[PDB]
RNA sequence: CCUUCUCAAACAUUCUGUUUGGUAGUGAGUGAUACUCUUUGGAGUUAACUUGAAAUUGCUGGCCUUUAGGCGAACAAUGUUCUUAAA
């Protein structure tokens, strides 16, 4: 989870302040005009809207999905492990939607999809996928089927 | 005096910093009225290489946009040679209160036609120029407390000095 | 404590880099000093001067005794400091960081500067800066009245000074400033005499505001300090008149 | 394969249009001077500090 | 309905970069980053030519 | 010197050798190997007692890179030109600035890469080896040249095309585009690379027989060989195809007396 | 059943037996530690072997490291079965070159040159396409 | 959880030329044609290919120094010991 956060902090989305700042820069450029060039590769960032996260699945586009364990309407979330299971998407259940919101400039996020990666980071991506599929899909798959809890307090 | 002081652990800075900031802003605007009232520019410019010689009041150049007798322009047209031995700071400021010049060899080794007087406190004086007057610095401390000239035989090294009791 | 798995690797890699650049420095300087310049990069040495992307001007080295003031920097990220550089910093008393000292620059002095370059910062000092350092900081280890005597005293008594420096006839710590600036008769007397220097950390740190200062200063230090590891590394010099405005 | 045979939109491949409309909004505001350029703003602050 | 100055200048850049042909300017990356439609290019260029430059 | 006639004899012998003949659609790499000339030099102590990844650029009368490129258009692997430049260098130099200079003499830089790009984009052995294996011509600034071998990988220093070539944009304090402009011309068409391994064996790669004229091969070989004789004390010279056995042309028997 | 001897694959660069000892001592005391190295240059072959005082401590150490991401690529550790022993590893250094003199004098090997040249000419006959030299 | 030698000199003015020096590697595996000695111990060189930094034990070069270091540096040499990246 630590290296996953080190990954996703490389792919923080742009804040509203940074967005508006770049907008003012390019707008002052065109205001002088001083139309510098027409070139920008793409923005790459994490994807965090829940319907947008589900939307990036069923294409498939999600290379990694982080799923928060704690959501108070849990039923918003419960299909996502089975859905990434059947779609073959490398999902991982992360601990705490606040830590998702921190990496995406929200209060909470509860989902975290990531699709587009630079070539500098693509090799780290694949080994992280293999790491998760070793650590999550192998360890917890059979005990996922078992009825948890039931022991009194 | 500009000496490294052992810091006291007993004090708390949290009060003296408030006094500091209050006095800083207050003296700041009072320096504004004293610089504008004296008719010159409130930001004082300094040559950087003059500051590299010495970090003092003499670093600042003071722009444009009589003296009260006798203490102002006491020792008029008067050229000093303060040594490297003497404390440069308060003697420098006293000569600037006189209007005379300051020549220290301590400033010189960073890198003497009109010099008549050495302020020095040393037992053995090397070059012993009879043209140049050899004086222990209390002469400046006593002349300005009197406002007037006194003989320098007591202030000649290594003659003993009158126990100075200031006018208070 | 269970330390970690990663720090032990990163320290090993960083010590590998440092031992490699130090061996390169040692071999290249041995070929220079033995004067067997056959197949090396360059014969003569260079000096960087960072002033205000900011302007970085180089000079050739002049074989002239130059007064330098050295300032110990916290070394790079996870590095065990090697025993060769540990020896030099032990001689120059630069352990317990934020600790400078005044030094003489000659051509016998110069090769160690390429060695300990990733741990200190160098430049040309000014008389006002030297003056401020000595009039505001400095303690002398001292044999006193009746002591167990690991005993250090701040610079107040010029008569304590001319006591132990009467043989060279050195009085009045202003003259110690003057002869460190001068180095005409004896610098090294004053150099062994003023033996410890201590500088405060520039930012107090722990607390909400000062972490911003720490991050901005780490970014500034990343812009300023450059780590060549080439063994023909130009000696980086910075404005100690700018630096002591921060640290003193 | 995915579920839906939804055709890919044009705007996923080209630089974002709505960004550019917001850009031209700011351009029209600066042409009217309602927004000061940030270099001019730093120029203002550097004089106003003194 | 006239044309805007930036985009007619953009068309003017395309008119000098490729000339008149459309299959080359359609597969141009620089100055066709919105990847305009084959014939929208024709329509805007014909409007620009009728406006300016025959 | 060296009897040019004997070299024409040997190259006509090799033309006759390569003229000797369920099959593949796409032809064997080994079939492409058995058509190519390699110069082999026996010489006393070709070590500098140290590894030499620096390539010597020998002045050659003819330029095989143009028939390389013309057959490479037909070939599967396409001839590509890589330059590796400084960060400020790439900030200043643009691509049309290169392309306008190179269309004058009719060549082309494929790509230009910063050391930053080597150390973050291709900081992965698979992607780096795949990126290097695309290229035939690899150029690098002489300042960067001695910083390369941690970034390049030793798999790049194994082969002759994959190892980079020293080239200089500077002539004064700063670089000039004129210097890089004519310097890529010098390195392109007037110079040939030389690996400098250890031992007594030197292998020099010349190229496929189908690319050049055989007397032009002979002229280039004799020029290079005289350059080598004036350079180094040489035991012998065997030139051959790497499928073929050797061909003794020239040797100096007294070099071995002069070693000890 | 499993022994205390341990196989570790996929080691990072510069990560050696000293660091293996210094790290895996925190699991418990270890019996032996070795790294597969290359012969000409003493570089890691990225796999090695551990031995502990206990098999149970070996299994505990193997559990918390089997899918462990570390310094780039992940690591994989497997304990060995009870029938397993350590064999044949050595810390190889960089083997520098040696130069030894030629034993034969210069005129014997001049004769050897003259013989080998004629012999290669006979091979160019024997292969064989014509070569008058 | 770190980041990799990102230039030196000489000559020359040609609006920049000419010469010289400066580079230890990712491990494993395939494999052409050979070359050189060594005194059989092989050693050092030579095309070409593969591979998600992959991964299972190739048994103990030599010489020199000190109690580990150099052979790409011989009165050559080296250690894991920097705290406001804390708690």
Curated annotation (Swiss-Prot), chain A:
Q: Would the keyword Transit peptide be found if you checked this record's keyword annotation?
A: no
> One GO CC annotation, please?
cytosol
Keyword field contains Ribonucleoprotein: yes
**Which molecular function terms from Gene Ontology are attached?**
RNA binding; structural constituent of ribosome
Which Gene Ontology BP terms does the record give?
Answer: cytoplasmic translation; maturation of LSU-rRNA
UniProt superkingdom:
Eukaryota
- Annotated keywords: Cytoplasm, Ribonucleoprotein, Ribosomal protein
Subcellular localization, per the record? Cytoplasm
The main place the protein resides is: cytoplasm
Q: What does the further note read?
A: Present with 238000 molecules/cell in log phase SD medium.
Subunit-level organization: Component of the large ribosomal subunit (LSU). Mature yeast ribosomes consist of a small (40S) and a large (60S) subunit. The 40S small subunit contains 1 molecule of ribosomal RNA (18S rRNA) and 33 different proteins (encoded by 57 genes). The large 60S subunit contains 3 rRNA molecules (25S, 5.8S and 5S rRNA) and 46 different proteins (encoded by 81 genes).
Describe the task this protein carries out: Component of the ribosome, a large ribonucleoprotein complex responsible for the synthesis of proteins in the cell. The small ribosomal subunit (SSU) binds messenger RNAs (mRNAs) and translates the encoded message by selecting cognate aminoacyl-transfer RNA (tRNA) molecules. The large subunit (LSU) contains the ribosomal catalytic site termed the peptidyl transferase center (PTC), which catalyzes the formation of peptide bonds, thereby polymerizing the amino acids delivered by tRNAs into a polypeptide chain.
**UniProt record similarity statement:** Belongs to the eukaryotic ribosomal protein eL8 family.
Name listed for the protein in its UniProt record: Large ribosomal subunit protein eL8A
Q: Fragment boundaries within the full protein?
A: 87 to 239 of 256
Swiss-Prot record, chain C:
| Leader peptide range in chain numbering | none
Establish whether keyword Transmembrane helix is in the entry: no
Q: What is this protein called?
A: Ribosome biogenesis protein RLP7
Q: Name one GO cellular component term.
A: preribosome, large subunit precursor
> Which organism was this protein described from?
Saccharomyces cerevisiae (strain ATCC 204508 / S288c) (Baker's yeast)
Q: Which residues carry this modification: Phosphoserine?
A: 204
Where is this chain's protein located in or outside the cell?
Nucleus, Nucleolus
Query: To which protein family does this belong?
Result: Belongs to the universal ribosomal protein uL30 family.
The function of this protein is: Involved in the biogenesis of the 60S ribosomal subunit. May act as a specificity factor that binds precursor rRNAs and tethers the enzymes that carry out the early 5' to 3' exonucleolytic reactions that generate the mature rRNAs.
| Note from the entry | Present with 7720 molecules/cell in log phase SD medium.
Biological processes, Gene Ontology terms: exonucleolytic trimming to generate mature 5'-end of 5.8S rRNA from tricistronic rRNA transcript (SSU-rRNA, 5.8S rRNA, LSU-rRNA); maturation of LSU-rRNA from tricistronic rRNA transcript (SSU-rRNA, 5.8S rRNA, LSU-rRNA); ribosomal large subunit biogenesis
Q: Which UniProt keywords apply?
A: Acetylation, Nucleus, Phosphoprotein, Ribosome biogenesis, RNA-binding
Q: Taking the first listed entry, what is the main subcellular location of this protein, grouped into a coarse class? A: nucleus
One GO MF term attached to the UniProt entry? structural constituent of ribosome
UniProtKB/Swiss-Prot annotation, chain E:
Q: Which domain of life is it from?
A: Eukaryota
Q: Identify the stretch annotated as signal peptide in this record.
A: none
Compartments, as annotated in UniProt: Nucleus, Nucleolus
Residues recorded as bearing Phosphoserine in the entry = 2, 4
Family (UniProt): Belongs to the NOP16 family.
User: What is known about its subunit structure?
Assistant: Component of the pre-66S ribosomal particle. Interacts with NOP7, RRP1 and RRP15.
What does the record give as the function of this protein? Involved in the biogenesis of the 60S ribosomal subunit.
**Extra remark:** Present with 2860 molecules/cell in log phase SD medium.
Protein name, entry field = Nucleolar protein 16
Source organism per entry reads: Saccharomyces cerevisiae (strain ATCC 204508 / S288c)
Q: What gene is it encoded by? A: NOP16
UniProtKB/Swiss-Prot annotation, chain F:
- UniProt KW Ribosomal protein keyword: no
Q: Does the keyword Transmembrane apply?
A: no
Q: Name one GO molecular function term.
A: protein-macromolecule adaptor activity
Q: Superkingdom of this entry's organism?
A: Eukaryota
Key words, A-Z: Nucleus, Proteasome, Ribosome biogenesis
Where can this protein be found? Nucleus, Nucleolus
Cysteine disulfide links: none
Entry GO terms, CC: nucleolus; preribosome, large subunit precursor; proteasome complex
A Gene Ontology biological process in which this protein takes part is: maturation of LSU-rRNA from tricistronic rRNA transcript (SSU-rRNA, 5.8S rRNA, LSU-rRNA)
Summary of subunit composition and partner proteins: Interacts with CDC4, PRE4, PRE6, RPT1 and SCL1 as part of the fully assembled 26S proteasome. Interacts with pre-ribosomal particles constituent NOP7.
As a miscellaneous remark, the entry gives: Present with 45900 molecules/cell in log phase SD medium.
Q: What does this protein do?
A: An adapter protein that specifically links the 26S proteasome to its substrate CDC4 which is one of the substrate recognition subunits of the SCF E3 ubiquitin ligase complex. Required for turnover of cell cycle regulatory proteins CDC4 and GRR1. Required for synthesis and nuclear export of 60S ribosomal subunits. Required for vegetative growth.
Q: What is this protein called?
A: Proteasome-interacting protein CIC1
Q: What is the lineage of its organism?
A: Eukaryota, Fungi, Dikarya, Ascomycota, Saccharomycotina
């Amino acid at each position: 989870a630590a290296e996953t956060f080190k990954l996703f902090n490389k792919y923080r989305p742009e804040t509203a302040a940074e967005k508006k700042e770049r907008l003012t820069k390019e707008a002052a450029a065109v205001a002088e005009g001083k139309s510098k060039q027409d070139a920008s590769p793409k923005p790459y960032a994490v994807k965090y809207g829940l319907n947008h996260v589900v939307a990036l699945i069923e294409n498939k586009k999600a290379k990694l999905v982080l799923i928060a364990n704690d959501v108070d309407p849990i039923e918003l979330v419960v299909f996502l492990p089975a859905l990434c299971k059947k779609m073959g998407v490398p999902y991982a259940i992360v601990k705490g939607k606040a830590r998702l919101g921190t990496l995406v400039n929200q209060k909470t996020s509860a989902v975290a999809a990531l699709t587009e990666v630079r070539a500098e980071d693509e090799a780290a991506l694949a080994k992280l996928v293999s790491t998760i599929d070793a650590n999550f899909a192998d360890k917890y798959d059979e005990v996922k089927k078992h009825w948890g809890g039931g022991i009194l307090g | 005096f500009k000496f490294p002081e052992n810091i006291p652990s007993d004090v708390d800075f949290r009060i003296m910093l408030t006094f500091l900031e209050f006095y800083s802003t207050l003296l700041h605007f009072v320096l504004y009225k004293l610089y504008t009232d004296s008719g010159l520019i409130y930001p004082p410019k300094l040559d950087l290489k003059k500051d590299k010689i010495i970090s003092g009041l003499s670093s600042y150049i003071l722009e444009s946009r009589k003296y009260d007798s006798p203490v102002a322009s006491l020792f008029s047209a008067f050229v000093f040679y303060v040594s490297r031995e003497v404390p440069i700071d308060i003697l420098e400021f006293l000569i600037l209160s006189c209007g005379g010049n300051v020549i220290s060899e301590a400033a010189m080794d960073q890198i003497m036609s009109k010099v008549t007087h050495q302020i020095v406190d040393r037992p053995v004086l090397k070059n012993k120029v009879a043209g140049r007057t050899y004086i222990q610095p209390q002469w400046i401390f006593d002349c300005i407390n009197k406002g007037e000239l006194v003989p320098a035989n007591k202030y000649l090294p290594g003659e003993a000095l009158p126990p100075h009791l200031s006018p208070w | 404590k269970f330390v970690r798995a990663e720090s032990i690797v990163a320290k090993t890699l960083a010590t590998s880099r440092e031992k490699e650049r130090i061996k390169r420095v040692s071999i290249l300087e041995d070929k220079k000093a033995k004067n067997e310049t056959q197949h090396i990069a360059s014969g003569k040495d260079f000096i960087l001067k960072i002033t205000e992307g900011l302007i970085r001007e180089k000079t050739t080295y002049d074989g002239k005794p130059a007064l330098l003031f050295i300032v110990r920097v916290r070394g790079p990220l996870a590095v065990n400091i090697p025993n060769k550089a540990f020896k030099i910093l032990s001689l120059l008393r630069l352990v317990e960081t934020n600790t400078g000292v005044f030094v003489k620059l000659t051509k016998n002095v110069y090769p160690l500067l390429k060695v300990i370059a990733p741990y200190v910062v160098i430049g040309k000092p000014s008389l006002s800066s030297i003056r401020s350092l000595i009039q505001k900081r400095g303690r002398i280890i001292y044999k006193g009245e009746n002591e167990a005597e690991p005993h250090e005293i701040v610079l107040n008594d010029n008569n304590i000074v001319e006591e132990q420096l009467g043989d060279h006839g050195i009085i009045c710590v202003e003259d110690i400033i003057h002869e460190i600036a001068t180095m005409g008769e004896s610098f090294s007397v004053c150099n062994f005499f003023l033996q410890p220097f201590k500088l405060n950390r520039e930012v107090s740190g722990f607390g909400s505001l000062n972490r911003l200062r720490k991050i901005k200063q780490r970014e500034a230090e990343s812009r300023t300090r450059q780590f060549s590891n080439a063994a023909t590394a130009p000696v980086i010099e910075v404005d100690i008149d700018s630096l002591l405005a921060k640290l003193n | 394969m995915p579920l839906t045979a939804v055709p890919e939109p044009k705007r996923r491949f080209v630089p974002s249009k709505n960004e550019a409309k917001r850009v031209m909004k700011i351009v029209r505001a600066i042409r009217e001077g309602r927004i000061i350029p940030p270099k001019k703003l730093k120029e203002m602050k550097x004089x106003x500090x003194x | 309905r006239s044309q805007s100055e930036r985009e007619e200048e953009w068309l003017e850049k395309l008119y000098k970069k490729h000339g008149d042909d459309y299959k080359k300017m359609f597969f141009d990356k620089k100055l066709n980053i919105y990847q305009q439609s084959e014939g929208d290019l024709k329509r805007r260029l014909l409007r620009w030519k009728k406006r300016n430059g025959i | 010197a060296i009897p040019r006639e004997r070299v024409i004899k040997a190259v006509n012998e090799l033309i006759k050798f390569t003229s000797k003949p369920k099959n593949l659609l796409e032809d064997d790499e080994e079939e492409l190997k058995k058509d190519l000339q390699l110069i082999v030099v026996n010489n006393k102590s070709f070590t500098g007692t140290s590894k030499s990844f620096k390539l010597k650029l020998l002045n050659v009368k003819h330029s095989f890179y143009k028939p390389w490129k013309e057959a490479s258009a037909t070939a599967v692997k396409d001839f590509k030109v890589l330059l590796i430049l400084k960060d400020s260098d790439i900030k200043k130099v643009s691509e049309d600035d290169l392309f306008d200079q190179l269309d004058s003499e009719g060549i082309k830089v494929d790509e230009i890469i910063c050391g930053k790009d080597l150390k973050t984009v291709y900081k992965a052995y698979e992607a780096r080896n795949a990126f290097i294996s695309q290229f035939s011509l690899i150029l690098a600034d002489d300042s960067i040249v001695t910083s390369l071998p941690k970034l390049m990988g030793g798999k790049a220093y194994n082969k002759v095309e994959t190892t980079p070539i020293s080239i200089r944009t500077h002539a004064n304090k700063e670089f000039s585009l004129t210097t890089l402009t004519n310097n890529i011309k010098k390195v392109y068409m007037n110079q040939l690379p030389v690996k400098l391994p250890r031992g007594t064996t030197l292998n020099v790669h010349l190229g496929n027989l189908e690319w050049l004229r055989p007397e032009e091969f002979v002229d280039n070989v004799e020029l290079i060989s005289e350059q080598l004789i004036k350079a180094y004390q040489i035991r012998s010279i065997f030139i051959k195809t790497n499928r073929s056995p050797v061909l003794p042309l020239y040797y100096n028997q007294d070099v071995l007396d002069e070693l000890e | 059943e499993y022994s205390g001897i341990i196989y570790v694959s996929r080691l990072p660069h510069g990560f050696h037996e000293k660091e293996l000892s210094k790290y895996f001592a925190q699991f418990g005391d270890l019996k032996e530690v070795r790294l597969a190295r290359n012969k000409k240059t003493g570089n890691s072959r990225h796999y090695g072997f551990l031995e502990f005082v206990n098999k149970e401590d070996a299994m505990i150490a193997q559990e918390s490291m089997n899918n462990y991401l570390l310094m780039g690529h992940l690591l994989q550790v497997r304990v060995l079965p009870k029938g397993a022993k350590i064999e044949k590893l050595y810390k190889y250094k960089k083997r520098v070159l040696v130069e030894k003199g030629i034993t034969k004098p210069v005129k014997q090997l001049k004769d050897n040159m003259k013989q080998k040249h004629e012999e290669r000419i006979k091979k160019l006959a024997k292969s064989g396409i014509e070569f008058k030299w």
